[PDB]
Symmetry: C3
Subunit: 30 residues, 3 copies
C-alpha cells in the first residue's frame, strides 16, 4: 500500500505543477 501511495502522490504532484503551467500558457495564448 504505502510505496504505491508514494508513487501515486508523486504523480499527483507532477499533475499539479503541469496544471499550473498549462493555465499560464492558456492565459498567454488568450
Amino acid at each position: 500500500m504505502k510505496q504505491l501511495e508514494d508513487k501515486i502522490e508523486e504523480n499527483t504532484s507532477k499533475i499539479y505543477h503541469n496544471t499550473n503551467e498549462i493555465a499560464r500558457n492558456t492565459k498567454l495564448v488568450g
Copy 2:
C-alpha cells in the same frame, strides 16, 4: 485496492483534461 484505484482514476481524469487543454494551446500556438 479500491480506494487506491479511486485515487489512480482521479489522476487519470486530471490527465485527460490536461491533455485536451494542452492540445488546444498547441493548436493556438501553431
Copy 3:
C-alpha cells in the same frame, strides 16, 4: 499490486509526454 503498478506507470508515461508538450508550448509563447 502488479496491475495497479501497471496503471500507475501508464499515468506516469502520459504525464511524461504532457510535460514535454507543455515545455514546447512554453517556449513558443515566450
